[PDB]
Ligand binder design. Structure first.
Ligand SMILES: [Cl-]
Ligand SMILES: [Mg+2]
Ligand SMILES: [Mg+2]
Ligand SMILES: [Mg+2]
Ligand SMILES: [Mg+2]
Ligand code: NA
Ligand code: NA
Lengths: 242, 242
């Protein structure tokens, strides 16, 4: 029946870390004459504008920056959400206060700054502080592998807060993320499942476990297609939609 | 007697929070034909370039952003220091740990992120967090006047860290600075002292006790002059050097 194509941005519509080409932009505008199209990415609206152009909301039926916490439909804001509004200020502060006190008790070779980075979709917590140098990240990650600093911190947090519907995810060298359950790319699906689409295709290049596309790829509401590069995506769309 | 004029920037060479005028810019360049000139300010190099021009290091013999923690002479960057190398990692962490535990206990309407910002010459500490929105900044600021949050925080820190060689200074709306004794504007004098100048003039608009020019003004190494406005600075310079 009616259908929607949903695309990851970076690595799917664009070369990794790169802006969309005029030829790809032209392709999608011709594809949009056949099927509705939308884009979803983890970055804020400003970066999405850098990757796809400042007129992004006019070129796609849906634009979902920040995994859909910001949502545009047919050119106007459909909806906006953030962690403080959803969790409430009290719980935000309990979580922040617990982390600050915990980090004050961690014995480390070095502590710097930005221990708590507040983002609309998550809190990124770092015992050493995100401001540390690359050399200092490596020192910390080596201590962390031997002492399980982040593992233990996250375990204690799961015991204290997870009944409030919070997921904790370790990643990289120095930090972990705290965010409400399901606030990955799947969040955007709430904004399209009511609009009467019989099939919602999803194209992404990080569909395997740990990738930022895995949960939306696996969700039963999407017909997921893994792609290796934008050219692989365009070859699949030629076979699917002529 | 070869001499040097050191100028505070904001309120002294420029109107408060504004770029220098082309008229004042031409005046200082004519003054440079008779005497070496230099600028000092607490802001970073980018802000100094915004106020005085991207070619500032070419237009002024000395440029001392961040009170001189970053220092240019004749267009080239000088020998550098930072707070963790001067204070030691142990004192840095005791300061950071104490501040983190204290912030955890403060009752605020809202808390966000970047509670501690690690800078070259200071630790900047915000009870609400530097990443807060403008509305949240004003909200906290009005609360701080009523409840004296920053003032009590700083009073407690002066007791806990007595004799460790630290200085604490509340500024702006949301934060206070912790820096080593003497790393106010006086810091830059290390780069001009005993370097051939019989007189080091200094001009500043906040030379009163509590002002960010007080210590450099009262330092014996400088012939200090208090100015009431950029036009008053020009009056004194025309008196002294014409
Ligand atoms: Cl922080
Ligand atoms: Mg991707
Ligand atoms: Mg699926
Ligand atoms: Mg001033
Ligand atoms: Mg003096
Ligand atoms: Na729904
Ligand atoms: Na800056």
């Amino acid at each position: 029946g009616p259908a929607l194509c949903l695309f990851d941005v970076d690595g799917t519509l664009t070369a990794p870390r790169q802006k969309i080409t005029k030829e790809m932009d032209d392709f999608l505008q011709k594809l949009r004459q056949k099927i509705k199209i939308g884009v979803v990415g983890g970055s804020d609206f400003e970066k999405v504008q850098e990757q796809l152009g400042n007129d992004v909301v006019e070129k796609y039926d849906y634009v979902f920056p920040e995994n859909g916490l910001v949502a545009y439909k047919d050119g106007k804001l459909l909806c906006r959400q953030n962690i403080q509004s959803h969790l409430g200020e009290a719980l935000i502060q309990d979580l922040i206060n617990y982390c600050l006190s915990y980090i004050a008790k961690i014995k480390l070779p070095k502590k710097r700054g930005t221990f708590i980075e507040f983002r609309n979709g998550m809190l990124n917590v770092s015992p050493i502080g995100r401001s540390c140098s690359q050399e200092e990240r490596i020192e910390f990650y080596e201590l962390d592998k031997k002492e399980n600093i982040r593992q233990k911190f996250v375990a204690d947090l799961r015991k204290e807060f997870a009944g409030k519907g919070l997921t904790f995810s370790i990643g990289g060298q120095i930090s972990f993320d705290v965010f409400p359950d399901g606030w990955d790319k799947r969040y955007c699906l709430r904004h399209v499942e009511n609009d009467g689409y019989k099939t919602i295709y999803f194209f992404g290049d990080k569909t395997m476990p740990g990738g930022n596309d895995h949960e939306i790829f696996t969700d039963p509401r999407t017909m997921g297609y893994s792609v290796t590069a934008p050219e692989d995506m365009r070859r699949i769309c030629e076979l699917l939609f002529s």
